Design a protein around this ligand. Structure first.
Ligand SMILES: *[C@@H]1O[C@H](CO)[C@@H](O)[C@H](O)[C@H]1NC(C)=O
Ligand SMILES: [Cl-]
Ligand SMILES: [Cl-]
Ligand SMILES: [Cl-]
Ligand SMILES: [Cl-]
Ligand SMILES: [Cl-]
Ligand SMILES: [Cl-]
Ligand SMILES: [Cl-]
Ligand SMILES: [Cl-]
Ligand SMILES: [Cl-]
Ligand SMILES: [Cl-]
Ligand SMILES: [Cl-]
Ligand SMILES: [Cu+2]
Ligand code: NA
Length: 235
C-alpha cells in the first residue's frame, strides 16, 4: 500500500505533486485486475493541472510513501519488482504505447528484492530522461507486490499480484530526439495470467528463479536505479 508523493529532478525536489502533476488515486489500495482500465494509470486517470519540466539526460526521481511522506514506504514483507514506463501524453495511455525504461526485480548479491531496496532508499527511484521528441509525456511507475501472487486474481479475486501504479505528467523540453520512442505495449493488456512474473510463489520458489514480466527495457533507455537522491526531512 504505497503512493507517489512527488518527484525530484537532478536532486531537486519538485514539491508535493499529488493531484497536481501526479494523477493520484484517492488512496493506496492496489490494482489487481489485469484487464481493467485501472492498470493504465490507476483508478482516477484524468489530466491534472501541472506537468514537470525536464531535459533529456536529467535524473527524474519518483518518491513513494505509505501514509505520510518518508515513512516506512511500503510493508517490507511485500516483496516484488519495480518498473518505469513512458508513453506520449497524446495517447492518454491507450494503445500500444508503453515503453519500458527501467526494471529491477531480485538482486542476487545483496539478496534483496526491489521493494526492499526502495524502503532503504526512502521511497526513491530514478530514471534518466531519454532522447525522445520534445513534448508531453506520461511516466508510469509500477510496483508489484507478490505476497499473494501464488494465486491469480482472475481465478480468486481475493488474492493475486498487487499493482501500485502512478502516472506523472512530464514535459521534455530540451532533447535532440536522437532516439525517437519505439512502439509500446498496452496497459491493460501486456500482463496476462500466463505472463512470467505475475503468478509466482515467493515462499517456495527461489528468488533467483524469478523472472519479471516483459517487456524488456528499451535499448534507448539511459539508465536508472533505486537509491535515495534527496533528504525529505530537509527539502
Ligand atoms: C476486471 O475488469 C474487466 C474489464 O474492465 C471487468 O469486465 C471485470 O468485471 C473485472 N473483474 C472484476 C472481478 O471486477
Ligand atoms: Cl503491499
Ligand atoms: Cl512541497
Ligand atoms: Cl482491481
Ligand atoms: Cl482527462
Ligand atoms: Cl504527507
Ligand atoms: Cl539508498
Ligand atoms: Cl486468502
Ligand atoms: Cl539531447
Ligand atoms: Cl514516435
Ligand atoms: Cl487486457
Ligand atoms: Cl536498482
Ligand atoms: Cu499493500
Ligand atoms: Na487479499
Amino acid at each position: 500500500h504505497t503512493l507517489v508523493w512527488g518527484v525530484w529532478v537532478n536532486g531537486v525536489d519538485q514539491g508535493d505533486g499529488r493531484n497536481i502533476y501526479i494523477r493520484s488515486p484517492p488512496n493506496n489500495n492496489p490494482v489487481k485486475n489485469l484487464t481493467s482500465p485501472d492498470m493504465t494509470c490507476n483508478v482516477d486517470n484524468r489530466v491534472v493541472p501541472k506537468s514537470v519540466p525536464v531535459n533529456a539526460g536529467d535524473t527524474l526521481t519518483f518518491e513513494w510513501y505509505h501514509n505520510t511522506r518518508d515513512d516506512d514506504i511500503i510493508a517490507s514483507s511485500h516483496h516484488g519488482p519495480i518498473a518505469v514506463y513512458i508513453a506520449p501524453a497524446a495517447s492518454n495511455g491507450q494503445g500500444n504505447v508503453w515503453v519500458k525504461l527501467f526494471e529491477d526485480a531480485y538482486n542476487v548479491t545483496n539478496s534483496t528484492w526491489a521493494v526492499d531496496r526502495l524502503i532503504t532508499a526512502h521511497g526513491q527511484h530514478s530514471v534518466v530522461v531519454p532522447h525522445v521528441a520534445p513534448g508531453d509525456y506520461l511516466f508510469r511507475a509500477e510496483i508489484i507486490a507478490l505476497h499473494e501472487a501464488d494465486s491469480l486474481y482472475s481465478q480468486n479475486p481475493i488474492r493475486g499480484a498487487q499493482f501500485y501504479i502512478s502516472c506523472a505528467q512530464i514535459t521534455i523540453n530540451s532533447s535532440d530526439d536522437s532516439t525517437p520512442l519505439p512502439a509500446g505495449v498496452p496497459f491493460p493488456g501486456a500482463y496476462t495470467d500466463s505472463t512470467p512474473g505475475i503468478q509466482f510463489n515467493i515462499y517456495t520458489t527461489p528468488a533467483t528463479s524469478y523472472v519479471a514480466p516483459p517487456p524488456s527495457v528499451w535499448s534507448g533507455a539511459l539508465g536508472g536505479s533505486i537509491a535515495q537522491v534527496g533528504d525529505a526531512s530537509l527539502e
